[PDB]
Amino acid sequence: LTTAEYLAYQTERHVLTILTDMSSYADALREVSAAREEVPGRRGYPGYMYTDLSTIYERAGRVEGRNGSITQIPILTMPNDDITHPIPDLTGYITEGQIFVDRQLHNKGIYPPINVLPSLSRLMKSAIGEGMTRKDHGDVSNQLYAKYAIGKDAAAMKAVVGEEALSIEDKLSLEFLEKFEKTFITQGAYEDRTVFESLDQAWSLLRIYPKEMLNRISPKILDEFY
Amino acid sequence: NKKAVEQGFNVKPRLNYNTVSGVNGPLVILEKVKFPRYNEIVNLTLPDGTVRQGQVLEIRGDRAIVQVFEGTSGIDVKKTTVEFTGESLRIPVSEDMLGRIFDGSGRPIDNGPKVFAEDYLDINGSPINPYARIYPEEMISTGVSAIDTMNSIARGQKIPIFSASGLPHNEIAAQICRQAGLVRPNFSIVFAAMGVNLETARFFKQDFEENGSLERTSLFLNLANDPTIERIITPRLALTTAEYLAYQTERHVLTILTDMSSYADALREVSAAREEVPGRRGYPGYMYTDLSTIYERAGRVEGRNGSITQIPILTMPNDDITHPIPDLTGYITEGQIFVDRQLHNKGIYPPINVLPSLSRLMKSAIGEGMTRKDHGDVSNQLYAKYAIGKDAAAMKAVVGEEALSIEDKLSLEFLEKFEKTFITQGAYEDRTVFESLDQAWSLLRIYPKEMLNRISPKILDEFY
Amino acid sequence: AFIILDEVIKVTNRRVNAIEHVIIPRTENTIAYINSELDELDREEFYRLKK
Amino acid sequence: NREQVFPTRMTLGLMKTKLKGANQGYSLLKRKSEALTKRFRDITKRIDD
Amino acid sequence: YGAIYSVSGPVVIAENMIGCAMYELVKVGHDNLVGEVIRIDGDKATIQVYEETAGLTVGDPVLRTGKPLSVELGPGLMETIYDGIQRPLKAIKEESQSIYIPRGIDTPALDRTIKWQFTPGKFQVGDHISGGDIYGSVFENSLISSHKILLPPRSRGTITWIAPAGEYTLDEKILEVEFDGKKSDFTLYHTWPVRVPRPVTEKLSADYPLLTGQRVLDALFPCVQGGTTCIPGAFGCGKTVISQSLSKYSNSDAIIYVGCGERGNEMAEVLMEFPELYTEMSGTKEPIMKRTTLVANTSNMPVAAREASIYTGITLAEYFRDQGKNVSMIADSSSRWAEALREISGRLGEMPADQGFPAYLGAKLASFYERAGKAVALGSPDRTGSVSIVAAVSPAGGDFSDPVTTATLGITQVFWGLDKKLAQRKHFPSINTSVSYSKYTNVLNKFYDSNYPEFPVLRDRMKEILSNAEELEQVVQLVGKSALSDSDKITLDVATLIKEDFLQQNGYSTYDAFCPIWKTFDMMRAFISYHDEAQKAVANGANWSKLADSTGDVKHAVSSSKFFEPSRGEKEVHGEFEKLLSTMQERFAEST
Amino acid sequence: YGAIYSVSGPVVIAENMIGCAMYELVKVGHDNLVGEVIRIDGDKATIQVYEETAGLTVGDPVLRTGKPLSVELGPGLMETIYDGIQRPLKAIKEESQSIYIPRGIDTPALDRTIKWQFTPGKFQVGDHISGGDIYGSVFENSLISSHKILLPPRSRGTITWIAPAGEYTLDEKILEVEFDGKKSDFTLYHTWPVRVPRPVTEKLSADYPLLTGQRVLDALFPCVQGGTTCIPGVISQSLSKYSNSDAIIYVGCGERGNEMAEVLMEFPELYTEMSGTKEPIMKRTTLVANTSNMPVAAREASIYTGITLAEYFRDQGKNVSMIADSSSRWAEALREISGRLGEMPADQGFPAYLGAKLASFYERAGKAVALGSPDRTGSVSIVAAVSPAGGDFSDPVTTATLGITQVFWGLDKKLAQRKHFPSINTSVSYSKYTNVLNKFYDSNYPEFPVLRDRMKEILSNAEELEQVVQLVGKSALSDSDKITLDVATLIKEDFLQQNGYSTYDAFCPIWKTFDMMRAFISYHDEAQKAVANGANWSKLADSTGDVKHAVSSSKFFEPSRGEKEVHGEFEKLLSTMQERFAEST
Ligand SMILES: Nc1ncnc2c1ncn2[C@@H]1O[C@H](COP(=O)(O)OP(=O)(O)OP(=O)(O)O)[C@@H](O)[C@H]1O
Numbered sequence A: 001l002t003t004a005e006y007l008a009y010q011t012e013r014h015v016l017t018i019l020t021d022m023s024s025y026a027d028a029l030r031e032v033s034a035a036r037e038e039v040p041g042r043r044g045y046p047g048y049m050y051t052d053l054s055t056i057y058e059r060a061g062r063v064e065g066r067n068g069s070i071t072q073i074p075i076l077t078m079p080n081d082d083i084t085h086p087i088p089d090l091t092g093y094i095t096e097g098q099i100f101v102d103r104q105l106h107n108k109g110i111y112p113p114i115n116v117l118p119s120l121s122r123l124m125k126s127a128i129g130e131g132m133t134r135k136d137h138g139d140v141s142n143q144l145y146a147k148y149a150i151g152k153d154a155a156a157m158k159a160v161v162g163e164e165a166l167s168i169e170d171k172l173s174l175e176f177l178e179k180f181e182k183t184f185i186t187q188g189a190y191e192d193r194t195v196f197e198s199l200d201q202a203w204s205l206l207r208i209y210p211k212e213m214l215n216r217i218s219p220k221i222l223d224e225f226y
Numbered sequence B: 001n002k003k004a005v006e007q008g009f010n011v012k013p014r015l016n017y018n019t020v021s022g023v024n025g026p027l028v029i030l031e032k033v034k035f036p037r038y039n040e041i042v043n044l045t046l047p048d049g050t051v052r053q054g055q056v057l058e059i060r061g062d063r064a065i066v067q068v069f070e071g072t073s074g075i076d077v078k079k080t081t082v083e084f085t086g087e088s089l090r091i092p093v094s095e096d097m098l099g100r101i102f103d104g105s106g107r108p109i110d111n112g113p114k115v116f117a118e119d120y121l122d123i124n125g126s127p128i129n130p131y132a133r134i135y136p137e138e139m140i141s142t143g144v145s146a147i148d149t150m151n152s153i154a155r156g157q158k159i160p161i162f163s164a165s166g167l168p169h170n171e172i173a174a175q176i177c178r179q180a181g182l183v184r185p186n187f188s189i190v191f192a193a194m195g196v197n198l199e200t201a202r203f204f205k206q207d208f209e210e211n212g213s214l215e216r217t218s219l220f221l222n223l224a225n226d227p228t229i230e231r232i233i234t235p236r237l238a239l240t241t242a243e244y245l246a247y248q249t250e251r252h253v254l255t256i257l258t259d260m261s262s263y264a265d266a267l268r269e270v271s272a273a274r275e276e277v278p279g280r281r282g283y284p285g286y287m288y289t290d291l292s293t294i295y296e297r298a299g300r301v302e303g304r305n306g307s308i309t310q311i312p313i314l315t316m317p318n319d320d321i322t323h324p325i326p327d328l329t330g331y332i333t334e335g336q337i338f339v340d341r342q343l344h345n346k347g348i349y350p351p352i353n354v355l356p357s358l359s360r361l362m363k364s365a366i367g368e369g370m371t372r373k374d375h376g377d378v379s380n381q382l383y384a385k386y387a388i389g390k391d392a393a394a395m396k397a398v399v400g401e402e403a404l405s406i407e408d409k410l411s412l413e414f415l416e417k418f419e420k421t422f423i424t425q426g427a428y429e430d431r432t433v434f435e436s437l438d439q440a441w442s443l444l445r446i447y448p449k450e451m452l453n454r455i456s457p458k459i460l461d462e463f464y
Numbered sequence C: 001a002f003i004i005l006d007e008v009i010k011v012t013n014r015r016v017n018a019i020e021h022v023i024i025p026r027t028e029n030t031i032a033y034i035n036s037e038l039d040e041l042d043r044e045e046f047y048r049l050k051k
Numbered sequence D: 001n002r003e004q005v006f007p008t009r010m011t012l013g014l015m016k017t018k019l020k021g022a023n024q025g026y027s028l029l030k031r032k033s034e035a036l037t038k039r040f041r042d043i044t045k046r047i048d049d
Numbered sequence E: 001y002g003a004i005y006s007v008s009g010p011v012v013i014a015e016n017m018i019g020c021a022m023y024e025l026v027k028v029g030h031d032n033l034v035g036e037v038i039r040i041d042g043d044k045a046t047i048q049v050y051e052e053t054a055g056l057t058v059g060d061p062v063l064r065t066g067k068p069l070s071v072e073l074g075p076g077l078m079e080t081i082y083d084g085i086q087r088p089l090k091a092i093k094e095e096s097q098s099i100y101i102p103r104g105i106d107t108p109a110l111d112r113t114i115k116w117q118f119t120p121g122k123f124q125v126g127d128h129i130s131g132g133d134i135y136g137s138v139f140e141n142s143l144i145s146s147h148k149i150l151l152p153p154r155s156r157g158t159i160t161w162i163a164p165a166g167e168y169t170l171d172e173k174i175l176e177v178e179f180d181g182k183k184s185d186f187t188l189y190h191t192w193p194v195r196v197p198r199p200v201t202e203k204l205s206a207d208y209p210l211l212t213g214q215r216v217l218d219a220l221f222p223c224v225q226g227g228t229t230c231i232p233g234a235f236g237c238g239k240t241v242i243s244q245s246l247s248k249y250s251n252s253d254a255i256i257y258v259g260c261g262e263r264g265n266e267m268a269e270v271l272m273e274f275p276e277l278y279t280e281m282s283g284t285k286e287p288i289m290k291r292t293t294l295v296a297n298t299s300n301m302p303v304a305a306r307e308a309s310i311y312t313g314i315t316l317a318e319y320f321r322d323q324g325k326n327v328s329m330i331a332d333s334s335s336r337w338a339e340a341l342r343e344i345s346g347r348l349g350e351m352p353a354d355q356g357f358p359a360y361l362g363a364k365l366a367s368f369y370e371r372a373g374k375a376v377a378l379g380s381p382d383r384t385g386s387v388s389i390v391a392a393v394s395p396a397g398g399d400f401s402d403p404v405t406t407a408t409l410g411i412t413q414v415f416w417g418l419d420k421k422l423a424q425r426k427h428f429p430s431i432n433t434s435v436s437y438s439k440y441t442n443v444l445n446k447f448y449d450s451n452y453p454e455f456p457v458l459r460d461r462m463k464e465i466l467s468n469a470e471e472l473e474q475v476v477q478l479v480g481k482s483a484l485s486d487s488d489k490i491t492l493d494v495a496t497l498i499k500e501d502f503l504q505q506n507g508y509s510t511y512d513a514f515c516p517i518w519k520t521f522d523m524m525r526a527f528i529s530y531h532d533e534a535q536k537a538v539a540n541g542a543n544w545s546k547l548a549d550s551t552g553d554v555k556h557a558v559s560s561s562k563f564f565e566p567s568r569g570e571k572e573v574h575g576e577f578e579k580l581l582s583t584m585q586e587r588f589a590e591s592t
Numbered sequence F: 001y002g003a004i005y006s007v008s009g010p011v012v013i014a015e016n017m018i019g020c021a022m023y024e025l026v027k028v029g030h031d032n033l034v035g036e037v038i039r040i041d042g043d044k045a046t047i048q049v050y051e052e053t054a055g056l057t058v059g060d061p062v063l064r065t066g067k068p069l070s071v072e073l074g075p076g077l078m079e080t081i082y083d084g085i086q087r088p089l090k091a092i093k094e095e096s097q098s099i100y101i102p103r104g105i106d107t108p109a110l111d112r113t114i115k116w117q118f119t120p121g122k123f124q125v126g127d128h129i130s131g132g133d134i135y136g137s138v139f140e141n142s143l144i145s146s147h148k149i150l151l152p153p154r155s156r157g158t159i160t161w162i163a164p165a166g167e168y169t170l171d172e173k174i175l176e177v178e179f180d181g182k183k184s185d186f187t188l189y190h191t192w193p194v195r196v197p198r199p200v201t202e203k204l205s206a207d208y209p210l211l212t213g214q215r216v217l218d219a220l221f222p223c224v225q226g227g228t229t230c231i232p233g234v235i236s237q238s239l240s241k242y243s244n245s246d247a248i249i250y251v252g253c254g255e256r257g258n259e260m261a262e263v264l265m266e267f268p269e270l271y272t273e274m275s276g277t278k279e280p281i282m283k284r285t286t287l288v289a290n291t292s293n294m295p296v297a298a299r300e301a302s303i304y305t306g307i308t309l310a311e312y313f314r315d316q317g318k319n320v321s322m323i324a325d326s327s328s329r330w331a332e333a334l335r336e337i338s339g340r341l342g343e344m345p346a347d348q349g350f351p352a353y354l355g356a357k358l359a360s361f362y363e364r365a366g367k368a369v370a371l372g373s374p375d376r377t378g379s380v381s382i383v384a385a386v387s388p389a390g391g392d393f394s395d396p397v398t399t400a401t402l403g404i405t406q407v408f409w410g411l412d413k414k415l416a417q418r419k420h421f422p423s424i425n426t427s428v429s430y431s432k433y434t435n436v437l438n439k440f441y442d443s444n445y446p447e448f449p450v451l452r453d454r455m456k457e458i459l460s461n462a463e464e465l466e467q468v469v470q471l472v473g474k475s476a477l478s479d480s481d482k483i484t485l486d487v488a489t490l491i492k493e494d495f496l497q498q499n500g501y502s503t504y505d506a507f508c509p510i511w512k513t514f515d516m517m518r519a520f521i522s523y524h525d526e527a528q529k530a531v532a533n534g535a536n537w538s539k540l541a542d543s544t545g546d547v548k549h550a551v552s553s554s555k556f557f558e559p560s561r562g563e564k565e566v567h568g569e570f571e572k573l574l575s576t577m578q579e580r581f582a583e584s585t
């Protein structure tokens, strides 16, 4: 973070630090705290872990005077895959948004095992704008999230009510879920997808629907892109 | 006549300690103390001139550990002077206290003069001799059908009120105060506020003024603004006042201890300030003993006509009986009046849930001479059939209304007409215990005579 | 077919009502009790470490 | 009104999984009931005809 | 004489006391407060004073008595109430003229002015008397007559002189025993340390049942005379009422009712009601109060005195056991004793162990519960007594996972669990028939085969009916009752009837205040015969709905059998019950 | 000046330091770091330094301020952004010319260089003066005029010398008060301990309503001036401008730094959309902004500093609405301080005093007559965003907030997903101030409580009808139930879904809200009468489609005209609806 602060603010460049194993950092903080004869907090971790993680995280951000920026992707390792764990809880409190990697997705397929239902970005609306990237980004992403949720619901409902009894909007949603978890999310470890190419692929998946089915997308965007 | 006055004419100089070995949290430690007592109240004079009042809690050799009631903020080692009164905290008690409004520490906030003390009584008091304590066996017609037919309250009972944060416990407790009276022919209410908000305190004051009870009430208001350490002594002051007014003045006394959850929260804060045991849910291991010191000061005594009835008002955090405060309070007290959030949301006033409610002084004071001879059997049958109705309602929710049998349908009808007509009652309407028993008998007459297995057959033949 | 569908729908609705009203309060209360109990154990350990 | 489960971290996780499965089954069975109710209304109309 | 060094709560670390023994009784303060030494750190000696510590100054004298906390056994205990350290509350009230208990009152534990008729025993001058031998008896009251005077344990020698028959006070000499050339003078009373159990010749396997008087306790989960009993349950479950009913209507010769942490109003209720009640024992109607003493240490009394109250009560029970009587101690809250222990431990600074209760809590509970048991008295003449400890545990939060409850279940033999669901809805006794157990059902087969041979079989049949109905209710509550078989419906109906009529007992109603063993056995026979007749009639082909419609009268007669007052006698009540079964059998054959 | 004796994390022990009051702020180190004394053991006094404690050496002087954590009350607060402990971030940036906050920066919380036009009050030399008595006035800003200067509440004595009118610097002495020695000189500003509440002559019942502008919050769940309010956390912007409070104390900015930047940018950019043509919103709102990077003590004391500022503005007679945000972040900071202090956890790791501190903080709010002459009345409305932890109302902080706060507005996630605004869940939200507000409603708008109760009953019946339509066929419902459901749907579409973006319904006033309430009540009564008369529901709907359209357009009617023009339009609409309903029969 000191190197990022230097580069971004005294050099006017964008950084995007990627801190790995915040769980390992928290364990290191645990050992440093307990070496000073201090009682452990809730889950053994020091009570001031919130303050320390707040310093480490909030060391990032944009400033008015300088043209640089410090984005941050602190990559945690949730013990026992528990969100109620102190490190995930404090990180969710301090940071804005969260990206989840799913064990079910990892078992089912290949990189990246990221599920979109529990993963969201709080300042997404600012990044996905009109002048920056494309004007259809927000509508496409919202539509994809809604149809992925409906696809998961239909996949659960198929084994309950039979495949035939599913509605048209459920069969199409199941097909979209298959082509989504298998072609859109599924990305090679070395292949690079620009934002525009990713949006084009998202539209390619979204075109299996009738134009009336896509409800979250604005009518102008539907007329121009679909 | 009274020889306790002669001991008053004795001036006793008190040491002024400028020695403060250190202050940590709400405790200030003194050094070089000449023969400290164990609960003597001391007057800390801060450098700014404001005088806090504290009491010692642990006294090693030439060392005393004072906790101040108004917090330790602003205490300096060099300039604070501590004056050792040499006696434990002693509220000045007089019969003229009836009609006054005091503060959390006993200071009069009524803009009047200091109480012309008739005797100084220690706030901690002393346990009442069980041989010298009479069993309270005189019913109190609280007007409320639930508290008069199913949870009848004796003269010396200490039955509290269990409720959640938003429930109208204050509205019910004010109804009891204005309607408290013996079934077979005025109470001197003593009101203690511990951490209640200004709206609640003003509501109680205005209700007492409106009903005219303010001429017989000595309010001890300790609002949320008041320091959090003197919530401990406020109920002690109220109970000392009630103990005087009953056992030495021959007055039947109601003692209202509102926000005992706030009192226990203050107790937990005091305990966690020291290195005390955490008990359950963080509350001190001696919380049972402290709550007992509070509650057990009620009751009637032999040879003295005065009686004290305690109606503490609790605030269950999650409306859970399993919480330490309601659990220990129901363990110590002689019952409880459970105010139901479910009934309140349904629209019933009073929203008293009788199933968690209990009155241990009902066995006596319910009979063939104090109330009607059918009272106990009627109440037992009402609990049985109301619980059966609640179980039938749960079964209705689970497997539809059609699956219920004739008994379950009758139970549902009885529960509807019981919650809607019997428990439900106007805020200013009082019902005689006999009228409430007649309504209960109508509700039982919903059922056929055969299904009433809790009514003794003689009573069933005579009253059906 | 109508009679069989009526029986199946009745059984399913009874199952949904049972699941919700019984299980979800039951499992939620069990979760709350377990959280409280582990909180108490953590508090006892904290007190022992403070001593 | 609580399951007789010994308080433990493994027990807590098992009960969270049970709660998630119970909610999923509740939603799925309610949707199945709605579908079967639509089919039953259609069957009743066809039976009258 | 030492000095006080530190006063923090109910513990007083007193300095300048080199030579103080562990658990040695002291007198802390100018008012001579009663305290016991816990730790001895050099000349310092931490003391748990059994009174109020408010007002103790640093420097107050502390006397060393030299002897442990010693109860004062002897005549005059039977009809009294004690303060935990064996201070007669009546004497305190009469001496103080105040409704309070003054700090430091040193009234004698036993009335010294009262003159007791003394009848010398078979021993005379020259007979070698041993510890625990009976050298005389005194007439205490009409019920407890011949309050046998026992030679103190560990006291032995040849009788030099014995007091002739007459009237004596406690301070007057009664006996002189010569041991190794040193004469020892013995009075009517004698002291005994409460910590050490009174010795017995040899304990015996308890076999006679303790007839509680409650239907479920006496039938489903019986307790023997001489066995520990546990009654957990949240507030309002019925532990105090069960204890009081057991003390009122038990077959025990004497009661030691110990209240630690219990309200003063319960003590007032006992003092007010026990003299009113009467017992049919000893061939005459005498008040219950004449054979029950109360150790009253309420919740607002000093914390440290709850342990002293428990130990004083158990030692009084052990004394009346050594007298050859069938005593039953009733500790009102072992949980409150444990909470007192936790408060003392936290004030001292020991390691909290589990929940804050001290690590020695399990051992202390085990020792206290091991004090009980049927035993042969120490000395000749041979006589056998028993102490049944029926202590009501009070779990925190109404959960049976508390450390006190777990230790008590581990050490005791009978567990009468109470469910708050049945505590509400007025279903007392609120006994949880699923978790409750009694381990004396095996040994009680001798008594059952001797008196009521069908009692164990009927109890087992009722238990299995209750278990089947519990399973049926569990499955029905989630899957409805539209698929049950006729046998399942019969089981559910009969078990609901059992819960509504048999298991539930209104202890405050004249008919159900005391259901004796014969009435309970007859009603079990009635209910089991009803269930068997219904099962046989339905298996014959009769529809259960029509059978219930036709036999509603028989069902009402069975369910109303509790109203038969036991005061009519065994012959009258059993005569009505025999007609009840005969009519029920006829009304099940005519209907079928 | 003492000396540092021990440093172990942010726990500095200073020796040879005798005379340090409890909780007294000190200047730790050579860089003038600020820290509070948390315990004293004689000469040694343990200090929790607010900023980073790295680099502190043994023997570093520890200066003594002599006062506890205090807020510099006085002119110059209104248009300023502050930190948790009132660090003037704007002036700090201007002086340092850097994006960082230098450690131990000593920029005064109030601009000492600006000149204030002081006008002496009625008090003259030689007159006895009491705490809180107004002895002058200062023109601070256009939106906030007559910044009345108050004597410090603890101060007492007689006036010895008062400066005449003119432009005075904030550090120049303005008044000398003698009390057993003229040892008191008072400038335009005074410091007040932040934890210690500002005294008042008498706290009064909160009766006058808080007009939030939103129709839902002003009709179904009203709040009173001087009353506490709860929000799960559009509402914040509405209270900032549309509220009739004469001042605003925003103590939010959230835990996220991006949220703080967005709030700071939005507050200065937004103008007075309420009454006042040309006036910035920031001209009356002080921003106590604290990010997670800020010291934990500052994060915990942000709300206390804000409430003390609000009580200072109340002591001048101004109605103040202190919008509090990120109360979950404040609770996290309090828990962090508790864990640092080793305080025993009480519930879910939170300290034992959380409920007590929250209750005292909310009891700070209330309508009260200000201390000292002239007799004047002020109010401190608190609107604290509860911010439930983990999306559930199970946190102890959330439970305490719902227990002490009197109004819960209950923003609904499902309603927000339904694109509804303000998306307040009518089934969960509540307001305990209706009983008190009945007095003002009888005084001004008599039928408003009856209409509100009618809509509450209508909403309950609508929920019942929705449950019935979910269970069985919708057509199986009765005509009255269908009419009630349609009326409730229209109410939710027009009355409640009034978006603030459009200028037509940006801020519905109380008179427009009452007109809409009367129109809806009249429509419901006419529908019920038509149903009772036996007319078909479909025919009645076909005939009264015009009336329904008029009722819907009543919400869209511009409130700019106001006065009787809006009232006259409602009367014509009500008369037309009655005539149309009668004609249909
Ligand atoms: N066998 C019974 N018959 C009739 N009523 C009973 C019976 N047992 C209990 N009750 C009723 O229920 C109440 C329960 O009070 P009880 O003294 O038994 O409580 P407890 O469980 O011992 O409480 P605590 O733990 O506070 O001492 C009694 O006061 C009485 O009203």
Ligand SMILES: [Mg+2]
Binding pocket: E239, E240, E262, E332, E392
């Ligand atoms: Mg009891």
